[PDB]
Amino acid sequence: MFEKILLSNPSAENPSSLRPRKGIIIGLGQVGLACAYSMLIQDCFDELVLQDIASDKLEGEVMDFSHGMPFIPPTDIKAGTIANEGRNADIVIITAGVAQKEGESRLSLLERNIAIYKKILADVVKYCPEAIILVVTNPVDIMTYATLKITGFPSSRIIGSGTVLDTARFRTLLAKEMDIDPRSVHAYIIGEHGDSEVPVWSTANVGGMKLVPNTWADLPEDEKATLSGIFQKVQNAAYDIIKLKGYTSYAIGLATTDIVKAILNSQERILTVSGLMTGMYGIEDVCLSIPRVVSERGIIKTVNLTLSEDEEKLLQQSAKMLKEVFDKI
Template sequence: MFEKILIPNPCSEKPSSIRPRKGVIIGLGQVGLACAYSLLIQNCFDELVLQDIDADKLEGEVMDLSHGISFLPPTDLKSGTVADVGQNADIVIITAGVAQRQGESRLSLLERNFAIYKDILKDVVKYCPDSIILVVSNPVDILTYATLKITGFPSSRVIGSGTVLDSARFRSLIAQEMGIDARSVHAYIIGEHGDSKVPVWSTANIGGMKLVPDGWENLAQDEQNKLSDIFYNVKNAAYEIIQRKGYTSYAIGLATTDIVKAILNSQERILTVSGFMSGFYGIEDVCLSIPRVVNERGILKTVNLTLNEEEEKLLQKSAEILKDVFRQVKL
């Protein structure tokens, strides 16, 4: 019956030179679902495989999302594993892990999430050896470093979502205070995606005009208080959200999509993703966030951001905190 509805045209096959964009999301909790939804509505992949340990929930979520595909640009969405996408997967997004508890720091999640990652990565290496791995689970910097060490992938192809969301929150709150569009604010949060994150006030600017042109010490007290409040709200945003609704999801889903688009479209975007440090600011052998150029090869370049003395010390301290935590882990 159905074969009579659409008659195939022998000359209408997709040219072999056009390769579909393929992705996998491992872990379909609240963050994984937010990523999947955001990626679908922004038409990022031609084929998207969702993987989760809970088979019934996985099938239900895929069914629910699939029923909305007719409202969107078409995506071949299905449940499965990394084995189903084949060796030409572009990006493997890992959101798997246990949820952050109220009042729990990201670093305290490490022991609970690390064992899960070791199992996941065995299959990623086997079935998707040429993919870019995008780590979203927390503590993201530690898990990005672990992913790099376990997989043996080039550091350019192991990326953490890092402080992309923190930087977005930073710009958003500055924009609210100034009464302008957040896209006109240029400001970064660097270091750990966690309690030791560092605000780079020295280069923060709006339309080329620095927010702190003459140094922090030369700001009036009320100005210092306003900026301190902005960073406090950035630093504690996740804790505040978790206290109220139990988890964060939507904003990290959008941040993940932004990174994916930069990779798939080779945008040469500067994003504060987490990646391997090998000498910048005297920091070695750790993953954390600084501005990096991202394209289809992953991390292409690192921006040699000029930091003042205090910011550089804070970044180095952030790196040492992450190193101290990782020293306690046995790969």
């Protein structure tokens, strides 16, 4: 019908059946919904699958997303599962998890979320063998290492959100202090995501210049107070979001979207994602956040940072405690 409006051309060939850039978000709580809303507005995928337990809410959220799509670039948003709608997805973003019950042990919450991952990752290994797994569930360093051991995927394709969020705020706050384009600053926050993450002051760089030209002790007193207050501001912000709101959703959603951009657009961009440590600083068999080149096939290269003696000791201490916690599980 409608041939009186638009007359079809008989010589026109059928459109190509191109493979869509395809993602799936597992766990559609506040974090997963924030990721979905951002990735839809920023047009990350051609097809986006949302997987959670069958409820009217999940379907209502999907229909809410679908009804607003005309205002943004198109995306085939839908509810589904890995084994069905989500087969051969390019990126699998896992935000699924459960909240710590009243009086529950930290090891008990880990074993509960790890059990949740084992059921999830079994479908990912079977139906998304070539996919990159982006882990967001906390603690992200433990869950990223568990995902690596459960899946058996190449370590390059098991990626955790890590300290990407705090590093970006660290970079932006430092550039704001100096009235300069934030893309001119290379300052990394590495290690275990949380209160023990390490700012790499020794290699912090602004447009080629070292923020610490010699050693930290040689810096003027006012610069040491200003630089230390900037990193403290980053840690205060992450803590206060959990204290005032209970959790982060919008910030981690934007950081997760940014990681997806580097992967899908093959940007070869430096990101402090969480990933397997393989020999650097004598650290093995654990996941930490280190600046890495991220592209279509995941973690392609690692920035071979030379840490100061104090910075490296903090990193190896975090690696020791993370290996101990995982051995207890």
